[PDB]
RNA sequence: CGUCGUCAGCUCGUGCCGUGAGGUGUUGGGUUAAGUCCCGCAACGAGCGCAACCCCCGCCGUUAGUUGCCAGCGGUUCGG
């Protein structure tokens, strides 16, 4: 909530090629080949994205944070497991929202599984299973690691490159999910309901947003947190 | 019942794409006797198949000696 001047590389977007029109509105110029976000109108969207979050999160809204551009996973994969708001973190199914009932009989195999081997039925049945089950259970957590958490359908999305997770944001349009998401100079600015103009290459850009935004929710929940252990994600 | 053919296939449910017939999945890369498995993927699963569970042949044990052996000894018309 004091990220005004700490914006330090969020600024930095794509080259001059690889870009979208749509989000010239939110670029202040071109300093040597590379679109430079407007600081201005970043912080205008933030405004409103932020006053989004907290309204939907003081009422105890669901937001499911998707990110795969292989930048952001580390970070989602802990900002999401920060306050309970789920995440998809490996690669996003095709169907996860749209056909929610069948990922969700997925799910309960997952923790059909867990109650196995918690169960000592694990010796019974020989090792064959005992090594079937065991790597479907691997793929399982690899996969719906974060996704389990969803016992309906979310109330919200978060992104971080709408570009490579189109698909979710497809699916999210269809049931009417609002999109909350990162977008950048390669990305459609129409799809996305609550922009946040900033970077999704850059480390130190995502963990700022989405450490601040975890800290809004959970501040509107009370109980403010303890700063994310992310920083030491920068390697 | 024969046949393609023990050939590796044929489909469905939901989702997605297309005005529609349909497509996707079932394509792809690696692998296998195999749609076998792995990885990838707008697909996620499932059914009939594949394989497995059945039988026979291979090694060993337990249980049991009207089949077997001077393995072990005695008798022997010396033929368990
Ligand atoms: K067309
Ligand atoms: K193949
Ligand atoms: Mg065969
Ligand atoms: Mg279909
Ligand atoms: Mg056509
Ligand atoms: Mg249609
Ligand atoms: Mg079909
Ligand atoms: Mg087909
Ligand atoms: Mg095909
Ligand atoms: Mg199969
Ligand atoms: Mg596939
Ligand atoms: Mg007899
Ligand atoms: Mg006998």
Do not use: C
């Given at each position: 909530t004091v990220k005004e001047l700490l914006e330090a590389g969020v600024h930095f977007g794509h080259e001059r090629k690889?870009?979208?029109?749509?989000?010239?509105?939110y670029i202040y110029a071109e300093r040597?080949?590379?679109?430079?976000?407007?600081?201005?109108?970043?912080?205008?969207?933030?405004?409103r994205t932020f006053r989004f979050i907290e309204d939907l999160a003081?009422?105890?809204?669901?937001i499911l944070?998707?990110?795969?551009?292989?930048?952001?996973?580390?970070?989602?994969?802990?900002?999401?497991?920060?306050?309970?708001?789920?995440?998809?973190?490996?690669?996003?199914?095709?169907?996860?929202?749209?056909?929610?009932?069948?990922?969700?009989?997925?799910?309960?195999?997952?923790?059909?599984?867990?109650?196995?081997?918690?169960?000592?039925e694990i010796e019974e049945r020989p090792k064959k299973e005992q090594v079937r089950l065991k790597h479907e259970?691997?793929?399982?957590?690899?996969?719906?690691?974060?996704?389990?958490?969803?016992?309906?359908?979310?109330?919200?999305i978060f992104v971080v490159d709408p570009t490579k997770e189109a698909i979710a944001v497809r699916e999210a349009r269809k049931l009417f999910i609002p999109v909350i998401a990162l977008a950048?100079?390669?990305?459609?600015?129409?799809?996305?309901?609550?922009?946040?103009?900033?970077?999704?290459?850059?480390?130190?850009?995502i963990q700022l947003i989405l450490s601040r935004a975890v800290?809004?929710?959970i501040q509107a929940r009370g109980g403010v947190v303890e700063p994310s252990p992310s920083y030491a994600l920068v390697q």
């Open positions: 690889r870009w979208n029109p749509k989000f010239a509105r040597n080949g590379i679109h430079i976000i407007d600081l201005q109108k970043t912080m205008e969207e933030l405004e003081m009422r105890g809204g669901t944070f998707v990110g795969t551009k292989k930048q952001a996973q580390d970070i989602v994969r802990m900002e999401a497991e920060r306050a309970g708001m789920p995440y998809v973190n490996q690669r996003w199914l095709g169907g996860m929202l749209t056909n929610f009932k069948t990922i969700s009989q997925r799910v309960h195999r997952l923790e059909e599984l867990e109650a196995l081997f918690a169960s000592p259970l691997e793929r399982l957590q690899k996969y719906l690691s974060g996704f389990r958490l969803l016992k309906r359908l979310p109330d919200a950048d100079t390669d990305s459609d600015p129409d799809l996305v309901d609550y922009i946040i103009p900033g970077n999704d290459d850059a480390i130190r850009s800290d809004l929710i």
